[PDB]
Amino acid sequence: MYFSEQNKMIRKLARDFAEKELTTEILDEVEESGEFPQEILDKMAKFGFFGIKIPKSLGGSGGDHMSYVICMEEFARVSGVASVYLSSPNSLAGGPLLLSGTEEQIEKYLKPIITGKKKLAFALTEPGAGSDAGGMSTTAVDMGDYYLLNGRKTFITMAPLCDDAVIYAKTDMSKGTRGISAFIVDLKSEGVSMGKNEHKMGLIGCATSDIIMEDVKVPKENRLGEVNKGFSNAMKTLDVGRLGVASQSIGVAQGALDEAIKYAKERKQFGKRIADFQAIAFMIADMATKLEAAKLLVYNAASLMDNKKNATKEASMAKFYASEICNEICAKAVQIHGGYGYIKEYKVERMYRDCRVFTIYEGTSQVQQMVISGMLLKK
Amino acid sequence: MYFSEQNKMIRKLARDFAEKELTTEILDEVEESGEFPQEILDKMAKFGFFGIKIPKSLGGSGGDHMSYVICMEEFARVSGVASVYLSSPNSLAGGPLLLSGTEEQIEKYLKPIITGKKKLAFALTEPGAGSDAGGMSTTAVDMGDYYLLNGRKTFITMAPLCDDAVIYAKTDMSKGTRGISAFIVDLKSEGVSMGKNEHKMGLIGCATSDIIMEDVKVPKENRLGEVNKGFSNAMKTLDVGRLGVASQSIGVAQGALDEAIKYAKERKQFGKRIADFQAIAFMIADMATKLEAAKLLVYNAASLMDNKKNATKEASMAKFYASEICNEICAKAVQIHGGYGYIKEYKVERMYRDCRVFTIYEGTSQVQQMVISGMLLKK
Amino acid sequence: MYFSEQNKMIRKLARDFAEKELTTEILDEVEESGEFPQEILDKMAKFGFFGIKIPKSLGGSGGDHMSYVICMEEFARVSGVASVYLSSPNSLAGGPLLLSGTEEQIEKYLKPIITGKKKLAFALTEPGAGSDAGGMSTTAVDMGDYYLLNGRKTFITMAPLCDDAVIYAKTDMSKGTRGISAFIVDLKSEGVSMGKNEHKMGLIGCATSDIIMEDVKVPKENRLGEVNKGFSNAMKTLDVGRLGVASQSIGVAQGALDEAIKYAKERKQFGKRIADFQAIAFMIADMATKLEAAKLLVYNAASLMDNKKNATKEASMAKFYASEICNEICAKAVQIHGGYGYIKEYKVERMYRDCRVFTIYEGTSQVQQMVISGMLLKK
Amino acid sequence: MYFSEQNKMIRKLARDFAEKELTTEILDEVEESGEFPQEILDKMAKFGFFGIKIPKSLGGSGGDHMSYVICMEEFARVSGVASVYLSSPNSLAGGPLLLSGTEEQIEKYLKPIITGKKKLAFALTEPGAGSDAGGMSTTAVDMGDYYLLNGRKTFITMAPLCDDAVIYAKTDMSKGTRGISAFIVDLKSEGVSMGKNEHKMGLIGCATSDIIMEDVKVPKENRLGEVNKGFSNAMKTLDVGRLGVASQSIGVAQGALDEAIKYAKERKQFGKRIADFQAIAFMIADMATKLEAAKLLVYNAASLMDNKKNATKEASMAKFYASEICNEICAKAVQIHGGYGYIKEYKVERMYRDCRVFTIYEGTSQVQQMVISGMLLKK
Ligand SMILES: Cc1cc2nc3c(=O)[nH]c(=O)nc-3n(C[C@H](O)[C@H](O)[C@H](O)COP(=O)(O)OP(=O)(O)OC[C@H]3O[C@@H](n4cnc5c(N)ncnc54)[C@H](O)[C@@H]3O)c2cc1C
Ligand SMILES: Cc1cc2nc3c(=O)[nH]c(=O)nc-3n(C[C@H](O)[C@H](O)[C@H](O)COP(=O)(O)OP(=O)(O)OC[C@H]3O[C@@H](n4cnc5c(N)ncnc54)[C@H](O)[C@@H]3O)c2cc1C
Ligand SMILES: Cc1cc2nc3c(=O)[nH]c(=O)nc-3n(C[C@H](O)[C@H](O)[C@H](O)COP(=O)(O)OP(=O)(O)OC[C@H]3O[C@@H](n4cnc5c(N)ncnc54)[C@H](O)[C@@H]3O)c2cc1C
Ligand SMILES: Cc1cc2nc3c(=O)[nH]c(=O)nc-3n(C[C@H](O)[C@H](O)[C@H](O)COP(=O)(O)OP(=O)(O)OC[C@H]3O[C@@H](n4cnc5c(N)ncnc54)[C@H](O)[C@@H]3O)c2cc1C
């Protein structure tokens, strides 16, 4: 779109930073030892990347959505897992706090994660409930002085590293999608237990496991907003989160392309260089135009959010198209690198593996199509 | 992108107009009798659609590029051939006049075509020179009091209806791309003769033939700008023209989609309506998201032109992606209509046929990829 | 696959024939005047092309299914409409006779159409019943000595040229798919009336209209096989018909490819010939490998039919994949021809238009996917 | 095609075998410890899988090419790395021996690898010479009683496990593609040294490194056939090898599809089971029809080889189309599994990673297109 002069500066910051602090030496160590260095996280919160769109009124940074997408893109370009550690407090953890949270809860909960002292997990997915989050099975019972919960959450990002976790349980089992409340649970409490870290294909550096809740008591003073609102809470958080996922799609995309034209300029085979063979140069073109076309897709979505019009469709398109053509791009970049793009030392293979969940998690491409077509066909 | 409040009004105008004046009854008669009604052309120039981006300083309308794209889109949606009769004086005829034309030439030539009295053909393509316009063969010789030309131009839109035609001939046969001048030729003069109207697949209502030049003398006072500049003249006209072609791609696209979701809402087969079958609804989604993604592509290109930064890449992407996904869309719309979308009474078949040149003319998709990749790979 | 030496001979015949009798001069007149020359049909039946798979036991020709596909392919390469006039008596007309017809019915009905004296239309589709042929609305009532019918059929190939027509009507309206009988109706009789010839996009030379039935009485002696088997009758004819449609898919494909590499060898741009630009040569490759891959798909289906195992899935895959990649091929061939491929004199545009229905009629690609997936997931 | 009854039996054997000996427990340990169990290789040679197409005349097994593809497919379905350990002695090692090797050389070299005592690496690729194998830089000098070599080979499968290696060096540096001889070098000799094992994305269990030659002297008695024929030797081995690669393409495809429809039958969302949502069932269909279409592509190529006509194009199409649509399939299968398909315990992710090299090695898809188009346009 068009970038505000402050957002151009932020772009400059996230560039020099993400490029400078995420060295080859480190990122290799993250894949081998699935542990992101706490020192870097602290370093990020110190300059506020953990607080981009939250305003100074609550002790944030006072940026706009476009600044969140800009930082998301420019980070994810260099490393995927970095992006994961970035989106959580900006969007998935700091979302429902920012919407359905009393002033006390925000004082005791949000500012810690913006400054990097506390870590917060957004926990919705169950073994029986994936795309159909409305078909949850975790229960939440009102006992008066506290709430009692009994359930199980799979695929919970960062959870073993998290201190509290926003967990969605079914309060009114009859109302279904109308009867879900949202609670803040201290993961250190009773009954709560974690599953094994899951061995995933990519995005290695951030642990991901199950949250098991066994007769865990949660005080009433730690419930998110109104009772039976939890579902709308999670949707309206999910829109900005999906903007996040499309944002990292576009990041790692632009990156794998940059590595693409670099290798294609440098490698020679028939006396010509690779990039002077028509098949390749056209292929580069094709990738470039999709990437831009759709950069414009997602930029537009975020600008809508910033000007307060509903972005529920526009974001869904952004996540869908961005992640899909990201995968197409990542693959093609392998193919330009040729054989060498299959060895782990060439950065393009880590990308190719990373960019695959992008079409699954945060709502599959199918769920995206369901939202969009369902929005265009109502009569 | 974001639309200026005047451009929203223009959108309203071109909508009510194109919708109101291009009735089924007429458009059917245009396909049967390959003749667009002069009365409608006059009607268009009377409200200035023939003069959108040319400023009031020269007797134009004072709009911006985004207003040219808006009108191009909203017209082309309803009828392709209408768009053709629209882009000519706005972009292809009024371009080189606006750039490399003396004040006298513009007084005697441009204002007529803005008011619809004169018609001007942009003639570059030869039988031997297509994508490679630099390999022209029409010659132009300096005799002192006039220029003498000898050549032949194929595929010249509107030419039998045109009064003068901007014709590019080779002056310095040795310089090639560096030695091409541009001349204004009265088509009524000596030696000049026209070929047969070509029977094309779609875009029926506008005649298209060869311009044959046989020892035709042209006065020196009718040359475009400097000698041997003609080529750069034609390129810099071609950028805004390509914006035009992408503009009509996006128009007829949005239209065939609108007909798409309409038929899919109305038709019933298994008791359900068509649109409630998952394959279709998802298909609608896919088409919609590409179309928007890329609407954002071309809107962005035009905004760049309006703010004076070079749009030579951005436009090329716009023409490429827009026309290609337009064809994909047009086809899919046939497939939703099912059998009925194969009969001429259903508007979708005229679209499907129209939208096919979009990837060929104004520079093929291959030439587009050549420009783009060649721009990204220079080292 | 591997062709039996007699089938190679048949390939030679249909090649030299279709090439020699279907000249450019004729086919243009067929497009302009939507009338195929009766003299050519007679000429075809005289050498037996009207009777390929019907055996000499009934006075047919004694070929195998692979011989029907061979003639279908080699004809369709040269002209689409020829194929339409070819498949009808081989598959669509001679099918239900061959399954559920007594020897008398075959004596009075089939031999005429094998020798080209009579013409038979296969009429199933209604305005309300397309893909869902089971939701028919045409009725058939038992009066003892004859049946009484009241309904309406759209999109009936060749019908205004046909002497009798196999019409599927609902006898037991409650049984639905289980309660449909098939009757032979002489179109010259009472009540029978035709709709307008439909103006279709391509495949021009064969009329196609509605068959309107208003209290038309039909004798019992003209019913297909047992009562209420008709639906399975029509399905099992539809399988070999679908083999037909894939056959012409593969035909027009080979043609448009042959024009593709021919034009690409002959035309030169920028000094090189077209075919020496890497993009084109690769494009040719891509079309070729798909085409072959899937030629092998369809040859195999027909060979299965010849060795008597059920070919109901395999044919469905053949029709689906063959028709879709046929369209992709046809388009790409236009794009190689460049601008010239948009004028009707270049054969590639007639192909491009013909090959479009291929994915709709004889069961859409969607119906194909429904059949195939429904066949693979039953456990 | 149509399988000879002995080849159906062989299909049964390789199925029950690959299924019974390659258990989940083992294959996980192979990924973790990049070492395939020697006990299994011995077990395979004991039943002759190491000698499929080599005939009993030389102490082989007497199968046909179709039997090599059958075992390749049915093995690769279950595990990719198994296939790698399978194709080497059948095609890549036993190829050049079979063409340009004297009976003594075959006595001392081939029978060991058919019985699994010795291992032979096919070493052609250099760091400067990939697709352009003709631009080699390894040298071979004639000293009379032996040859002296100095060069370097990257990406040599199985090399650290191999006892001898067929190495292609340039003898006449001026003749280029016409001046390459092929030699057998015992890897335990002098000068010979190995590079590091390369960390590849998938196909983990088989080591792959550089073969470094530093003034290694090789006796004349170990040269392949006539001098300077070696290149055509290596090409004509590469054709059957490419048939191999397409064979495993088709294998891992069938596997990932089988996991696809299995998971899609068992998993239920929103109340329905996965497979009863139209998008999925159609997706399954699409993968299936392509897979079959092209299974037929490759079966046919191998049958041609068995009946002795040149299969150089047909195999190239088979490798190209087979590997590409294999990747498309593998990915889509991930997407059906949803989130769970991104964790290593679900077999589909190992497939997805394995099937990626398939389009690069044994000649890239680009080299395939170059061969195919170059074969179709020569006139
Ligand atoms: C797991 C594995 C095992 C291997 N085993 C063996 C083995 O046993 N023996 C062996 O000899 N090799 C082996 N190789 C090497 C492999 O076969 C080759 O590397 C392969 O041919 C590609 O080589 P390259 O990457 O150097 O090609 P590069 O030339 O480096 O790649 C160029 C890229 O651009 C494309 N390209 C190349 N030339 C052109 C052109 N003129 N026009 C357009 N596009 C072009 C290609 O498609 C490719 O994508 C193995 C590789 C791997 C990954
Ligand atoms: C040139 C021509 C010749 C013909 N000749 C004959 C002939 O000789 N005999 C004859 O009987 N018919 C004939 N037909 C009719 C043709 O075979 C049928 O119309 C065809 O089956 C499609 O019918 P329809 O358009 O009504 O389908 P519609 O149902 O009107 O179309 C529905 C559309 O949505 C899709 N769709 C349908 N149901 C579903 C679903 N449940 N889920 C998802 N998607 C769905 C379909 O793919 C299709 O694109 C002819 C048609 C043409 C164009
Ligand atoms: C309706 C219509 C209106 C037109 N109006 C005008 C007009 O007003 N003015 C005008 O000047 N022209 C006009 N044209 C012509 C059109 O602009 C030209 O045809 C177009 O620029 C391409 O020329 P060509 O068709 O001759 O392409 P050709 O070059 O003849 O065709 C070459 C083909 O191969 C590809 N190709 C070409 N060069 C290369 C390369 N180097 N590498 C790889 N692939 C390549 C192209 O994609 C194309 O498919 C019109 C055409 C049509 C159909
Ligand atoms: C790295 C990672 C991190 C994650 N982090 C989180 C997290 O922080 N919080 C969280 O809540 N979840 C998280 N998840 C889980 C993820 O959000 C869910 O998996 C996702 O929402 C989809 O759920 P599912 O994978 O179970 O899909 P499933 O529903 O189990 O899979 C169904 C499959 O079929 C398709 N499908 C589903 N429903 C339909 C339908 N109605 N019609 C047609 N097709 C359909 C889908 O595309 C999908 O491919 C994470 C997952 C991963 C891999």
Domain borders along chain D are: 1-119, 120-237, 238-379
Residues forming beta bridges with residue A343, ordered by sequence position: D200
Ligand nearest to the CA of D280: 4
* Whole-number Å distance between alpha carbons of A363 and D70: 40
Residues forming beta bridges with residue A141, ordered by sequence position: A148
Closest C-alpha among D313, D315, D312, D307 to residue D64: D307
Q: Which residues of A201-212 are buried (b: 16+ CB within 10 A; e: fewer)?
A: bbbbbbbbbbbe
φ/ψ of residue C10, rounded to 5: -60, -40
Q: Tell me the CATH number for domain A120-237.
A: 2.40.110.10
Point out the residue among C284, C292, C369 whose CB comes nearest to the CB of D297: C292
CB contact under 8 A, C200 and B364: no
CB C54 within 8 A of CB C90: yes
Closest C-alpha among B126, B184, B131 to residue B152: B126
* Whole-number Å distance between alpha carbons of A111 and A97: 11
| Tokens encoding B352 | 């499907």
Question: Which method resolved this structure?
Answer: X-ray
Closest C-alpha among B257, B300, B229 to residue A377: B257
* Whole-number Å distance between alpha carbons of D368 and A5: 49
CB contact under 8 A, C356 and B339: no
CB C140 within 8 A of CB C169: yes
Q: Residue C151 is inside which H or E element, if any? A: strand C146-157
Calculate how far, in angstroms, residue A289's C-alpha sits from the geometric centre of ligand 3: 21
Could you identify the residue written with the tokens 């049909």?
Answer: C41
| Tokens encoding B130 | 């297509």
Q: Which pairing describes strands A208-219 and A146-157: parallel, antiparallel, or unpaired?
A: antiparallel
φ/ψ of residue C204, rounded to 5: -75, -40
CA angle A253, A258, A261 (to 5 degrees): 125
Name the CA dihedral angle for D69, D73, D75, D81, rounded to a multiple of 10 degrees. 100
* Residue A341 Cα: closest atom of ligand 1: 25
The number of C-alpha atoms within 13 Å of B85 and in the hemisphere containing its C-beta is 28
* Whole-number Å distance between alpha carbons of A91 and A88: 6
* Whole-number Å distance between alpha carbons of A217 and A186: 10
This structure's resolution (angstroms)?
3.1
Catalytic residues of C: 362
Q: How many residues does chain B have?
A: 379
Amino acid symbol at D73: E
Q: Residue A164 is inside which H or E element, if any? A: strand A164-170
CA angle D15, D20, D24 (to 5 degrees): 115
Contacts of B286 (CB under 8 A, 6+ apart): A369, B332
* Whole-number Å distance between alpha carbons of B295 and A91: 28
Contacts of C101 (CB under 8 A, 6+ apart): C109, C110, C224, C225
Could you identify the residue written with the tokens 């207003």?
Answer: B67
- Which residue CA neighbors atom 16 of ligand 3 most closely? B361
Closest C-alpha among A78, A341, A25 to residue D198: A341
CB contact under 8 A, B377 and A2: no
Count CB pairs under 8 A between chains C and D: 99
SS3 of residue B47 by DSSP: coil
Contacts of A112 (CB under 8 A, 6+ apart): A118
* Whole-number Å distance between alpha carbons of D120 and D222: 14
A226 is catalytic: no
Closest C-alpha among C251, C291, C198 to residue C82: C251
Q: Quick one: how far is CA B213 from the chain centroid?
A: 24
Closest C-alpha among A229, A214, A60, A104 to residue A149: A214
- Which residue CA neighbors atom 21 of ligand 3 most closely? B363
Rounded to a whole number, what is the largest CA-CA distance in chain D?
A: 79
Which CATH number does the domain B238-379 belong to among 3.40.50.1100, 3.40.50.11540, 1.20.140.10, 1.10.3720.10? Answer: 1.20.140.10
CB D166 within 8 A of CB D184: yes
**Beta strand spans in C115-145 (E):** 120-123, 139-142
Q: How far is CA D136 from CA B152, D129, D155, D179, in A?
A: 51, 6, 14, 11
Closest C-alpha among D71, D80, D90, D89 to residue D22: D80
Q: C120-237 with C238-379: one CATH topology? A: no
* Whole-number Å distance between alpha carbons of D58 and D52: 12
CB interface of D with C, residues 288-317, below 8 Å: 288-290, 292-294, 296-297, 300, 303, 314, 317
**Beta strand spans in chain B (E):** 120-123, 139-142, 146-157, 164-170, 180-186, 193-194, 208-219, 223-224
CA angle A369, A372, A373 (to 5 degrees): 80
| Tokens encoding A224 | 């998110």
C299: how many CB neighbours lie within 10 A of its CB? 24
Considering only CB atoms, which chain A residues are within 8 Å of C281? none
CB B247 within 8 A of CB B72: yes
φ/ψ of residue B267, rounded to 5: -80, 135
Q: How far is CA A251 from CA A63, A79, B250, B280, B372, in A?
A: 19, 9, 27, 31, 21
Considering only CB atoms, which chain B residues are within 8 Å of D277? 278
Q: Tell me the CATH number for domain A1-119.
A: 1.10.540.10
* Whole-number Å distance between alpha carbons of C44 and B209: 40
* Whole-number Å distance between alpha carbons of B37 and B27: 10
Residue D349 at interface with chain A, using a CB cutoff of 8 Å: yes
Considering only CB atoms, which chain A residues are within 8 Å of D269? 130-132, 135
Closest C-alpha among A185, A204, A195 to residue A84: A204
